[PDB]
Design a protein around this ligand. Structure first.
Ligand SMILES: COc1ccc(S(=O)(=O)N(CC(C)C)C[C@@H](O)[C@H](Cc2ccccc2)NC(=O)c2ccc3c(c2)[C@@H](NC(=O)OC(C)(C)C)CCS3)cc1
Ligand SMILES: [Cl-]
Ligand SMILES: [Cl-]
Ligand code: NA
Lengths: 99, 99
């Protein structure tokens, strides 16, 4: 699809069998999701944003569908204000910016 | 142009007579620039993201040139770690997300 930016670019994602809303975010290097349970081991990561830094749990090789497109990759879980789909998964679904 | 998302989508902007590098950020509602002077009236605002909120100065009706394309809109100025071109100006240059 072609998504204009007059409203927030929100899509539905599916992770863990559950549908959630998330923001397609070209300014996020990584994907960050609100607290939820994911399988496997996690690793620590600190990420920075506008207001400072937060600690997140890094889960690798997680199956996730984004607007109907299948991806398998890293998901960070932590106290983000909104679910964010970052460039690591935007590239898996073939997204580009165009003007 | 078509910008892929393998790396951060950075572009050159011209704002207030200055050249800056900035991130094309579909996850940002508004445009946020590091500390600089701009002419005209402003009012204080709080904006929030990962890590919490920062205080900015809101300037309305500011002309920017973004990768060669002129726009006008609100610009927020304050202690952002990265210069951000948000949706309020991405719309004006015709930027879309495509996949
Ligand atoms: C109302 O207008 C706005 C309100 C909020 C914002 S925001 O900057 O808070 N943000 C809103 C989102 C969180 C809903 C836009 C977002 O694109 C932001 C845009 C952004 C980008 C970078 C920094 C601050 C904000 N990016 C990140 O928050 C973000 C997310 C994940 C990661 C990073 C940034 C990366 N952060 C980073 O490099 O931080 C340093 C620069 C401090 C080391 C680390 C890898 S993972 C912008 C405009
Ligand atoms: Cl505006
Ligand atoms: Cl349009
Ligand atoms: Na003004």
């Amino acid at each position: 699809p072609q998504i204009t930016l007059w409203k927030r670019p929100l899509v539905t994602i599916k992770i863990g069998g559950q549908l959630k809303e998330a923001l397609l975010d070209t300014g996020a290097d990584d994907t960050v999701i609100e607290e939820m349970s994911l399988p496997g081991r996690w690793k620590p990561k600190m990420i920075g944003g506008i207001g400072g830094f937060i600690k997140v749990r890094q889960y690798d090789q997680i199956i996730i569908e984004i607007a109907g497109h299948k991806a398998i990759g890293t998901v960070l879980v932590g106290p983000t204000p909104v679910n964010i789909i970052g460039r690591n998964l935007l590239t898996q679904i073939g997204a580009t910016l165009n003007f």
